[PDB]
Amino acid sequence: MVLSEGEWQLVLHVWAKVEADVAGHGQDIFIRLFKSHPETLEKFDRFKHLKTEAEMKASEDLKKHGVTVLTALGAILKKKGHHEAELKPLAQSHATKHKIPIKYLEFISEAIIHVLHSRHPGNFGADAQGAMNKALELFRKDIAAKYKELGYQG
Numbered sequence: 799m800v801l802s803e804g805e806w807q808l809v810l811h812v813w814a815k816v817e818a819d820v821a822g823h824g825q826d827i828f829i830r831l832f833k834s835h836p837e838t839l840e841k842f843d844r845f846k847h848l849k850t851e852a853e854m855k856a857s858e859d860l861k862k863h864g865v866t867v868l869t870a871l872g873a874i875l876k877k878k879g880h881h882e883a884e885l886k887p888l889a890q891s892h893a894t895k896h897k898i899p900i901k902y903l904e905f906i907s908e909a910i911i912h913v914l915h916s917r918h919p920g921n922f923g924a925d926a927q928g929a930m931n932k933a934l935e936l937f938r939k940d941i942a943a944k945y946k947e948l949g950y951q952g
């Protein structure tokens with residue numbers, strides 16, 4: 799699949815807002831993910847002990863992790879589709895070291911959309927959300943293709 803320049807512009811416009819506070823967006827996204835799909839928390843040995851949202855918000859390590867994840871996702875989005883190089887190491891670590899099913903990538907994509915919708919309604923209308931969903935589906939499609947090449951079905 800391919801996004802038009804117009805769709806990329808909608809994606810990058812709202813992402814520019816996210817970049818005004820990466821750490822804050824990272825926390826909301828992971829808390830949303832862990833609360834909506836608790837099973838995903840079991841994949842993080844470093845955070846699986848967190849019991850409440852209060853504990854999650856207070857975790858310095860979780861906040862730092864969120865910045866690392868969003869920064870990588872941002873680098874990929876800014877390539878506007880030409881992200882083959884950025885995807886390689888990401889796909890290998892998540893398929894071989896962390897063992898993350900495509901299903902879980904769908905869950906975090908939902909968390910991202912939810913948080914952007916909550917925080918940036920003025921820059922995340924129907925068209926912009928459609929553009930973001932398309933960019934995330936492209937991301938998941940390409941990561942899935944790499945998973946297969948690497949020998950991981952998940």
Ligand code: HEM
Pocket residue numbers: 838839841842843844863866867870871887888891892896898902903906
């Ligand atoms: C938006 C998609 C995602 C991106 C861009 C992303 C990015 C990253 C990055 C950059 C790291 C650190 C470097 C590395 O280990 O490769 C990381 C670590 C990790 N990711 Fe992801 N990730 C994504 C989705 C997920 C999902 C959905 C899970 C599973 C619920 C997951 C589980 C992990 C784990 C377990 C680690 C190691 C954390 C640690 O022990 O420090 N990731 N991810």
